[PDB]
Paper text:
However, Sb45 straddles the RBD saddle in the opposite orientation, at an angle of −36°, and frames the interface with CDR2 (residues 50–59) and CDR3 (residues 97–111). Sb45, which is oriented differently at the ACE2–RBD interface, exploits all three CDRs as well as non-CDR residues. Sb16 and Sb45 directly impinge on the ACE2 binding site, offering a structural rationale for their viral neutralization capacity. Sb16 and Sb45 capture more surface area than ACE2 or other published nanobody or sybody–RBD complexes. Similar to Sb16, Sb45 also failed to bind E484K and showed decreased recognition of K417N and N501Y as compared with WT. Nevertheless, R60 of Sb16 and H103 of Sb45 maintained contact with N501Y. Other cryo-EM studies indicate modest effects of the N501Y substitution on binding to different antibodies. In contrast to the effects of N501Y, E484K revealed major incompatibilities because of charge repulsion in the interaction with Sb16 via K32 and Sb45 via R33.
The virus exploits its trimeric spike (S) glycoprotein to adsorb to the host cell-surface receptor, angiotensin-converting enzyme 2 (ACE2), resulting in proteolytic processing and conformational changes required for membrane fusion and cell entry. Here, we take advantage of available sequences of five SARS-CoV-2 RBD–directed sybodies: Sb14, Sb15, Sb16, Sb45, and Sb68 (previously designated Sb#14, Sb#15, Sb#16, Sb#45, and Sb#68, respectively). These sybodies effectively inhibit the ACE2–RBD interaction and neutralize viral infectivity, and a bispecific construct, consisting of Sb15 linked to Sb68, blocked ACE2 binding and neutralized both pseudotyped and infectious SARS-CoV-2 viruses. Each of the sybodies represents an immunoglobulin variable-type fold consisting of two β-sheets packed as a β-barrel linked by a disulfide bond.
Numbering used by the authors:
A (entry chain A): 333 to 528
B (entry chain B): 1 to 121
Amino acid sequence: TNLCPFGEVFNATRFASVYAWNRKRISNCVADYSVLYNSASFSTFKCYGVSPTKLNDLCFTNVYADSFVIRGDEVRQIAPGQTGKIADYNYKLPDDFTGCVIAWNSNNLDSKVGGNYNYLYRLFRKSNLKPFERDISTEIYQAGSTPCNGVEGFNCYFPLQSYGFQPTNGVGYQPYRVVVLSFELLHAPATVCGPK
Amino acid sequence: QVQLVESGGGLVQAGGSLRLSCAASGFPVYRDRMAWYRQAPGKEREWVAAIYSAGQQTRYADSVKGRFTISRDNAKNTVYLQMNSLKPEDTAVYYCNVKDVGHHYEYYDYWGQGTQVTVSA
């Protein structure tokens, strides 16, 4: 029924900023997870509620692939129960997450001589993101009680911040591409299954 | 490594125009946010204008709305502030500004040396 288009997700030329993280729905296709897990291409490949070696034996109603770019020392925030600027304000996994977090160093593709500042993360927000919530607004953040009126100033901040990805950065401040696979099984016929 | 150099400015009569430049070295001008501030004699440094890579591209303080326009040139790694219909209240030292994040999540404010802008009544 056609192979699932994982390459469309994992080898995309352009990845999203985490604040505007990208979601692709995967449905009606044969998924080979082992070829991802056993590729030796990833520095993180961990699953919650499923084993990585058993993914090829599982059927799901739908799969969601969320993808974005963060720095390496923030990869640890892409896990249930984690807190920090990324989990709080950018991309939040639920406590009962079933799926996989997959990450790899993308310095060879996302670093520029002179610095790559294209990737942004939300630095300020009034409250924490709910699980799988996406906030792409770009309003001036009111830190105090006086309204901002579209204007920076005292207690009034632009809420997005560039990562400063210089190629000479330490590995903790290097860019990592991240894909979060979410597996849903509902009481519908399974559309995404493993091979054989 | 990160450095901002303001140029432009000088003396102008009320109603005249000026273009300030901010040459950036160590980082690309295409980034989250680049800002212009100004500090008048005896006053607090205040935000004037900013250009953003996401959302509304430009924002301006109320007192300069409709009279200033900010822009960027990537080939020259520069940000410009075009100032029209200048008024004596616009007299100040002008600074460009960026806010960077470091390895240990420090937030550093980078300023240039400033350029003097004088508008005579």
